[PDB]
Amino acid sequence: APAYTVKRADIATAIEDAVVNAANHRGQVGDGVCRAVARKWPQAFRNAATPVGTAKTVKCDETYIIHAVGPNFNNTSEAEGDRDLAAAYRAVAAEINRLSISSVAIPLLSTGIFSAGKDRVHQSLSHLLAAMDTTEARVTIYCRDKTWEQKIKTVLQNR
């Protein structure tokens, strides 16, 4: 069975078997919590593009890194947006079982440019957990080095 957890770091220097990333759509090096990963595993980004609402694993060397593409609410209808956000997390969850890892780090998708108002970990984390509960890996939630992580803790205890 999976289990939730929280860690205060950039989602890159994780130590779980697999590392999920808030990938843009185009697998390019880009803004926000993405670059951290690219510095360790640049080859994993190399043509790692995949459509909205999905996940694309690339093996850099001997790790499974999973690029999850969140929908941009700033350019989609809330129906499409919450749906494809769940789609992305579900595609991740599939790849978790698919590569069959025991532990994986996972950032709260819906930040920087995807949010367009959607700025509640509680919401994204609902769609994430609903999908990732279907796996049996550890579920180490990451965000950044900050008070946001504290909020994610309180939510994880409340939910």
UniProtKB/Swiss-Prot annotation:
It is a peripheral membrane protein. Phosphorylated by host on serines and threonines. It is found in: Host cytoplasmic vesicle membrane. It comes from the Viruses. ADP-D-ribose binds at residues 10, 24, 32, 112-114. Residues 1-159 form the Macro domain. Seems to be essential for minus-strand RNAs and subgenomic 26S mRNAs synthesis. Displays mono-ADP-ribosylhydrolase activity. ADP-ribosylation is a post-translantional modification that controls various processes of the host cell and the virus probably needs to revert it for optimal viral replication. Binds proteins of G3BP family and sequesters them into the viral RNA replication complexes thereby inhibiting the formation of host stress granules on viral mRNAs. Interacts with mRNA-capping enzyme nsP1. Interacts with host DDX1. Interacts with host DDX3. Interacts (via C-terminus) with host G3BP1; this interaction inhibits the formation of host stress granules on viral mRNAs and the nsp3-G3BP1 complexes bind viral RNAs and probably orchestrate the assembly of viral replication complexes. Interacts (via C-terminus) with host G3BP2; this interaction inhibits the formation of host stress granules on viral mRNAs and the nsp3-G3BP2 complexes bind viral RNAs and probably orchestrate the assembly of viral replication complexes. This is Non-structural protein 3. It comes from Mayaro virus (strain Brazil).
